[PDB]
Amino acid sequence: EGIDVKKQENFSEWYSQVITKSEFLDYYDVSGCYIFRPNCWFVWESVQKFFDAEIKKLGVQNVMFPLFVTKRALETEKDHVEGFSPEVAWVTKSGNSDLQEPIALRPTSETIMYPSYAKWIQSHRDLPLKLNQWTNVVRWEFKHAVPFIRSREFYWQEGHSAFKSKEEADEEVFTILELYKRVYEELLAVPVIKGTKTENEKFAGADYTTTVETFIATNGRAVQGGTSHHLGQNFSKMFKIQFEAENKETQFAYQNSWGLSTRTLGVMIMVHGDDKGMVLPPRVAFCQVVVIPLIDNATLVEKTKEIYNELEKAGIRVKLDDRRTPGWKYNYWELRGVPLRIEVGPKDLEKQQIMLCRRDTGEKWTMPLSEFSGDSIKAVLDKIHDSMLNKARKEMNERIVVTRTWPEFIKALNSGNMCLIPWHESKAAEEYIKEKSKLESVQSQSDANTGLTGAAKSLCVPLDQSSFPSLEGLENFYPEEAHKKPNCWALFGRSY
Amino acid sequence: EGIDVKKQENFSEWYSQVITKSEFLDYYDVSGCYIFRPNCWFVWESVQKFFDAEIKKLGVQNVMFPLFVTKRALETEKDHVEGFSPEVAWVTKSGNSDLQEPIALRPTSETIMYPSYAKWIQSHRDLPLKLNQWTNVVRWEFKHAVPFIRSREFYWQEGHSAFKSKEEADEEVFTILELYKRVYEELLAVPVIKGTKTENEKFAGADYTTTVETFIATNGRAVQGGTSHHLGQNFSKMFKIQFEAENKETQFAYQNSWGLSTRTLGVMIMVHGDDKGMVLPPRVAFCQVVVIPLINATLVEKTKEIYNELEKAGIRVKLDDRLERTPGWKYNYWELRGVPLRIEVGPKDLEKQQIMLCRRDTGEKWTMPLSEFSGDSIKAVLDKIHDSMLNKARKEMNERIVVTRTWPEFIKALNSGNMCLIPWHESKAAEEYIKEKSKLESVQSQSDANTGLTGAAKSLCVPLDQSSFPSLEGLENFYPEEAHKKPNCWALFGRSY
Ligand SMILES: Nc1ncnc2c1ncn2[C@@H]1O[C@H](COP(=O)(O)O)[C@@H](O)[C@H]1O
Numbered sequence: 001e002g003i004d005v006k007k008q009e010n011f012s013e014w015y016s017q018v019i020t021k022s023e024f025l026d027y028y029d030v031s032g033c034y035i036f037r038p039n040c041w042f043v044w045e046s047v048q049k050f051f052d053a054e055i056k057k058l059g060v061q062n063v064m065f066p067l068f069v070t071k072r073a074l075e076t077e078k079d080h081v082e083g084f085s086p087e088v089a090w091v092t093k094s095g096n097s098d099l100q101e102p103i104a105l106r107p108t109s110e111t112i113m114y115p116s117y118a119k120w121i122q123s124h125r126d127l128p129l130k131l132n133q134w135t136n137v138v139r140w141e142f143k144h145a146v147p148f149i150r151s152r153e154f155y156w157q158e159g160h161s162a163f164k165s166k167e168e169a170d171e172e173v174f175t176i177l178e179l180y181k182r183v184y185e186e187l188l189a190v191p192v193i194k195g196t197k198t199e200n201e202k203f204a205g206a207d208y209t210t211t212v213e214t215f216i217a218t219n220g221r222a223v224q225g226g227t228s229h230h231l232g233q234n235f236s237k238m239f240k241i242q243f244e245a246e247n248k249e250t251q252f253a254y255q256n257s258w259g260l261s262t263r264t265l266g267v268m269i270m271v272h273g274d275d276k277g278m279v280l281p282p283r284v285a286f287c288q289v290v291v292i293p294l295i296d297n298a299t300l301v302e303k304t305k306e307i308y309n310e311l312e313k314a315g316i317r318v319k320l321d322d323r324r325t326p327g328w329k330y331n332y333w334e335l336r337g338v339p340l341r342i343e344v345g346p347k348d349l350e351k352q353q354i355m356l357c358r359r360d361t362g363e364k365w366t367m368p369l370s371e372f373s374g375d376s377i378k379a380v381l382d383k384i385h386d387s388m389l390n391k392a393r394k395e396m397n398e399r400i401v402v403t404r405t406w407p408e409f410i411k412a413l414n415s416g417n418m419c420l421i422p423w424h425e426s427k428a429a430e431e432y433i434k435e436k437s438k439l440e441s442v443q444s445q446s447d448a449n450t451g452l453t454g455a456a457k458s459l460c461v462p463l464d465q466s467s468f469p470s471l472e473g474l475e476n477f478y479p480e481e482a483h484k485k486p487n488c489w490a491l492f493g494r495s496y
Numbered sequence: 497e498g499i500d501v502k503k504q505e506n507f508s509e510w511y512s513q514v515i516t517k518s519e520f521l522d523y524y525d526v527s528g529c530y531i532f533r534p535n536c537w538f539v540w541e542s543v544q545k546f547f548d549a550e551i552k553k554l555g556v557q558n559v560m561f562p563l564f565v566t567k568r569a570l571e572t573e574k575d576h577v578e579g580f581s582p583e584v585a586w587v588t589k590s591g592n593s594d595l596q597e598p599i600a601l602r603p604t605s606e607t608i609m610y611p612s613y614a615k616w617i618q619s620h621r622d623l624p625l626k627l628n629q630w631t632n633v634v635r636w637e638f639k640h641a642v643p644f645i646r647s648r649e650f651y652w653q654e655g656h657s658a659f660k661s662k663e664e665a666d667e668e669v670f671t672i673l674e675l676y677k678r679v680y681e682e683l684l685a686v687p688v689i690k691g692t693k694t695e696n697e698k699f700a701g702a703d704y705t706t707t708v709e710t711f712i713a714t715n716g717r718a719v720q721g722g723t724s725h726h727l728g729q730n731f732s733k734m735f736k737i738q739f740e741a742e743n744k745e746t747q748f749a750y751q752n753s754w755g756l757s758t759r760t761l762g763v764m765i766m767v768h769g770d771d772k773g774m775v776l777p778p779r780v781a782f783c784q785v786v787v788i789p790l791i792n793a794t795l796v797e798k799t800k801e802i803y804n805e806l807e808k809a810g811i812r813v814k815l816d817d818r819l820e821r822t823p824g825w826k827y828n829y830w831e832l833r834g835v836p837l838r839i840e841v842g843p844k845d846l847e848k849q850q851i852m853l854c855r856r857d858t859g860e861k862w863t864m865p866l867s868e869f870s871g872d873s874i875k876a877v878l879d880k881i882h883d884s885m886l887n888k889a890r891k892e893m894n895e896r897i898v899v900t901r902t903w904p905e906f907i908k909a910l911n912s913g914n915m916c917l918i919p920w921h922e923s924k925a926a927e928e929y930i931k932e933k934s935k936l937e938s939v940q941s942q943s944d945a946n947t948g949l950t951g952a953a954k955s956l957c958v959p960l961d962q963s964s965f966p967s968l969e970g971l972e973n974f975y976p977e978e979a980h981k982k983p984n985c986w987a988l989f990g991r992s993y
């Protein structure tokens with residue numbers, strides 16, 4: 001019917017109601033797996049089409065590798081298998097007959113693809129090799145599952161590239177990272193912070209991991225929104241991906257891998273949804289505009305149909321709801337997230353105008369028919385997009401606090417902020433901060449029931465350090481390493 | 497690199513060489529699973545884009561349901577689970593720990609989707625409900641795996657529709673079947689025969705199954721190319737998919753399901769490939785035209801202009817100006833990979849203001865005056881290639897369908913590589929009789945035997961269009977025990993994959 005708990009009253013219950021009552025998602029009888037209904041899958045198809053077109057400009061090609069991976073392949077890279085083992089699902093029988101060797105469901109495809117890379121790459125003329133696939137992924141998550149954010153089966157693209165040099169590899173890492181920033185900001189109207197993961201948080205077998213971090217204002221938590229890894233020669237040495245180089249010597253290839261998943265949808269909903277339900281960014285909205293005739297009515301009906309037809313020919317995803325009272329119809333499409341409603345009533349036609357209502361702010365205003373067109377409606381949709389992004393970015397920036405000392409850090413953390421702290425890289429320092437922040441923290445009942453914690457973890461070391469204050473005289477948060485002077489700022493906070 | 501085994505010499509070895517040396521597919525260390533390389537996956541993406549656009553016109557919407565299904569759901573429809581049980585893969589462990597509840601990988605999604613259909617459908621106003629998904633599926637095939645044709649993981653679309661009446665459901669079955677025909681003929685240049693499966697061959701839980709049958713001329717085998725099922729109320733009764741109708745009664749929904757897979761690619765290759773390698777139908781060719789300068793400043797600029805004009809016209813074109821490679825080497829390189837049209841730009845031809853074209857399917861070479869060169873005229877050549885590929889295969893298929901009124905005629909036509917039209921009266925026992933008896937009297941190649949195939953004939957389909965078939969008068973049932981069941985249609989029987 002409608003949403004009966006406010007977003008700030010019970011966040012996880014609000015989330016469940018919004019994603020199901022909007023017809024985005026349904027629950028399923030396999031734990032941690034969910035059903036993507038049409039309006040929801042439309043968002044992921046929209047991301048696919050945009051991202052596919054951008055990586056084609058880079059020479060990346062789509063492929064499909066198998067779902068299954070052998071134990072022998074999985075166990076090839078030391079760091080990788082150790083970091084993924086407990087989350088690997090194993091097929092052990094077919095029908096009633098046991099397999100000779102159990103085989104695993106892919107948690108990620110490095111060990112599935114790279115034996116082929118070693119065969120296909122023989123010369124520098126075979127490089128760069130840049131492949132991508134849109135697939136499903138299985139990770140038997142131990143943490144509490146969260147729709148979209150953390151599902152046991154999820155959908156992604158994973159790109160895997162091999163290069164003759166580190167310089168080419170580095171360039172791709174940040175090129176893809178910019179593309180992930182563009183998916184979030186230009187399609188989903190979600191602002192991001194680009195950064196590098198600390199040593200403790202980076203991908204197993206990577207030399208370094210970059211990330212686009214996102215912020216959930218309601219409970220003050222970050223979400224790792226997508227990652228782009230430089231694997232160096234770590235995987236090519238273990239899988240023997242070698243090539244006859246320019247210096248006539250045999251060299252190991254430099255590799256990257258990068259992935260973006262349906263976690264995007266959860267961030268979009270958690271950022272933009274409100275107490276009336278979904279609020280869809282126009283460029284991924286299954287329906288961008290709904291036209292509602294307010295109901296002698298013959299003329300009004302024909303003008304209503306012409307408005308619909310003009311928008312449809314312009315390529316706007318438009319619906320005509322000529323079914324029920326206006327108020328009931330209004331709630332119907334508001335719950336489902338439609339960005340713009342056009343109301344055509346008799347009083348409006350007398351003044352040669354229509355009434356518009358934008359979902360993100362609820363503002364209502366009139367537009368003269370002389371100003372109505374496919375292009376002017378598109379401009380309204382772009383204005384909504386910009387407002388949604390600008391609002392979220394302003395809130396995010398206000399909720400990032402420079403905390404030079406521990407008391408500032410704990411205060412900002414417990415009031416739902418992310419923190420920029422003086423940082424000197426150390427696994428021991430990161431663990432110290434995680435433990436001490438947890439001990440001095442408090443979180444909502446909803447977060448506690450969701451299996452979340454009040455601990456602060458490292459989110460990223462932001463790429464752009466230019467707006468941050470001076471590090472002079474600042475002390476390490478970890479007293480045992482007081483002599484290791486902070487040499488950058490790191491973003492820490494609570495997370496999913 | 498080249499194909500060193502001929503298509504007619506050793507079909508399975510030819511097939512392996514063509515799919516790997518063209519960079520379409522690679523083998524993998526899990527039996528029955530294969531790697532789809534870029535040029536190959538491009539064909540399936542091309543099918544996806546065409547088919548998705550067509551079903552959208554019908555109101556079908558894309559979704560995504562989970563990979564996993566519970567034992568409880570799977571066992572809900574009796575016939576369905578009995579027909580798939582031996583092929584279902586089971587997840588039983590995570591990490592080092594046995595799961596308390598094993599879960600299965602989807603062999604097909606009826607039992608995954610229909611509990612939700614029962615929730616989403618409440619009134620006739622909720623109907624029709626038409627959903628589709630592009631997914632991977634797992635069937636732990638007992639038969640020997642065949643790249644594309646029969647893999648243990650394959651990729652498909654599966655559509656699932658529910659209607660208020662049988663009439664609406666029947667109409668959709670044949671609308672989708674026509675779409676499968678169009679995929680094969682208009683994209684893949686493969687001719688099809690539409691028909692209904694016999695009772696013994698139809699989908700488990702279906703009221704009837706329709707099919708597009710295709711023909712592999714080299715070993716005289718049919719391939720079931722895609723299927724469109726009417727499920728009647730069999731699944732809606734078991735999953736309680738009910739609705740309040742207009743007359744205020746409670747009724748079970750009528751349902752269909754229909755699926756087309758990457759088997760399409762295998763049929764495309766087996767039909768069109770030759771002794772030089774892949775032969776790609778132009779509308780799924782990763783590269784439709786390759787432009788090759790014979791090496792010069794003027795010639796280079798004209799070569800680039802040809803490339804630019806074709807690219808602006810939306811043709812998928814490549815310029816092969818690689819330096820340390822001979823022209824003949826370049827020719828073989830792209831012929832092996834299946835490019836349908838090659839343009840050679842040499843100094844002698846440009847002096848006469850013309851270019852040399854070579855079409856992959858027949859190998860014919862001919863010149864085109866630059867005054868006639870354009871995006872449209874090159875597209876016309878590509879469409880001519882497409883029609884030729886389709887017409888050649890259809891002519892070959894039709895010549896290999898023989899009307900066999902008696903058992904001796906049937907065996908003779910079967911052993912000389914034909915499909916056979918036989919007098920037919922539906923009966924599971926008659927079909928089993930024909931299969932067993934033909935197996936005893938048939939012989940197949942070593943290549944087919946090694947591929948896990950059989951020389952036995954099975955029912956392929958009862959063709960929908962019987963209008964060209966001769967009279968059944970005086971013909972006897974092929975099954976002597978059922979002589980009292982008089983033939984009342986013609987059925988297509990033959991060897992198959
Ligand atoms: N359980 C999950 N559900 C959804 N997306 C996930 C999950 N785990 C990781 N991801 C996404 O997968 C990609 C790689 O994550 P990671 O290997 O943790 O860097 C990123 O785009 C993540 O957002």
Ligand SMILES: Nc1ncnc2c1ncn2[C@@H]1O[C@H](COP(=O)(O)O)[C@@H](O)[C@H]1O
Nearest residue numbers: 645646647650721722723755756757759
């Ligand atoms: N093992 C397989 N590999 C590839 N395609 C298959 C396989 N089994 C069935 N198909 C395809 O899946 C769809 C359904 O097949 P069936 O359930 O036999 O009607 C059809 O389009 C078949 O061609």
Ligand code: PRO
Nearest residue numbers: 108158227257258259
């Ligand atoms: O799982 C990951 O994080 C990396 C990036 C995509 C493929 N593997």
Ligand code: PRO
Nearest residue numbers: 604654655753754755
């Ligand atoms: O497996 C089959 O044959 C049917 C058609 C697609 C969905 N299930």
Ligand SMILES: [Mg+2]
Nearest residue numbers: 083087139141
């Ligand atoms: Mg993880």
Ligand SMILES: [Mg+2]
Nearest residue numbers: 579583635637
């Ligand atoms: Mg089968």
